[PDB]
């Protein structure tokens, strides 16, 4: 997270840490949608270009954390994966289209004051909040520039018009992703960076005062660059998929 700031303890209780067992290094971010289902970016588990391909037994999940490194006793809860589910349409070669994936925990997690699930959006919530100018919140223990934060970072970024998003990168944009961030003449700055992938792009509904995950930190050219913007996976367009996956398994 670039041009962000220290998060308020318990302000992102759905924030999950995708931790690699050996070597013990922070891999990506993720969101807690239920007691046994965690949502993250597919490119975090499978990205051949960097010979990246992890199995359930290779990864660890840390929930309710605020400190990036230190083990937060009696607060932090660690769970392990039973199965990984990467969308069959995930295109890792060209434009990381549908850069989403579900992770099923082996044992249900116990909710606390630091551990709680985020809401998935319905077609109505998605039709009200998904608009240019409408600001969303992004969190993660990713790089501060192109170094590493002490505690969880948070930044507020507005949704950008699709045309601007498209003409800002040479990559081919799809209906399964949206770009967010400030423009050059807007004065304010901020953006996500490496290690923030899988992190949620939540928005608070002014109709039921509930936080909804609308996007997933996917890709972007560099970090916090002028003219360039960060892209997030369109959660709603895939909910249908999420629903029947969590259902059948």
């Amino acid at each position: 997270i670039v041009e962000g700031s220290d998060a308020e303890i318990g302000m992102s209780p759905w924030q999950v840490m995708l931790f690699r067992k050996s070597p013990q290094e922070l891999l990506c971010g993720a969101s807690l949608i239920s007691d046994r289902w965690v949502l993250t970016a597919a490119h975090c588990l499978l990205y051949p270009p960097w010979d990246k391909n992890f199995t359930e037994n290779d990864l660890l999940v840390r929930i309710g954390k605020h400190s990036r490194t230190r083990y937060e006793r009696n607060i932090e809860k660690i769970s392990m994966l039973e199965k990984i589910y990467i969308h069959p349409r995930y295109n890792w070669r060209e434009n990381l289209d549908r850069d989403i994936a579900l992770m099923k925990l082996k044992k249900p997690v116990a909710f606390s004051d630091y551990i709680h699930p985020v809401c998935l959006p319905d077609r109505e919530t998605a039709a009200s909040l998904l608009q240019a100018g409408y600001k969303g919140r992004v969190t993660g223990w990713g790089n501060l520039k192109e170094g590493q934060p002490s505690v969880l970072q948070v930044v507020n970024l507005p949704i950008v018009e699709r045309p601007v998003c498209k003409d800002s990168t040479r990559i081919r944009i799809t209906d399964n992703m949206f770009c967010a961030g400030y423009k050059p003449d807007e004065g304010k700055r901020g953006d996500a960076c490496e290690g923030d992938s899988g992190g949620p792009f939540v928005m608070k509904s002014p109709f039921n005062n509930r936080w909804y995950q609308m996007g997933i930190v996917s890709w972007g050219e560099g970090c916090d660059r002028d003219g360039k913007y960060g892209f997030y996976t369109h959660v709603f367009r895939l909910k249908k998929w999420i629903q029947k996956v969590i259902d059948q398994f």
Partner: peptide
């Protein structure tokens, strides 16, 4: 799942975080 989007140290304590409003004030 039916109690989602409600933080126990905020919404459930009728308290706001310091940057929330920025988000709500962006709806025009």
């Amino acid at each position: 799942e039916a109690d989602c989007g409600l933080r126990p140290l905020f919404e459930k304590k009728s308290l706001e975080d310091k940057t929330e409003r920025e988000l709500l004030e962006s709806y025009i």
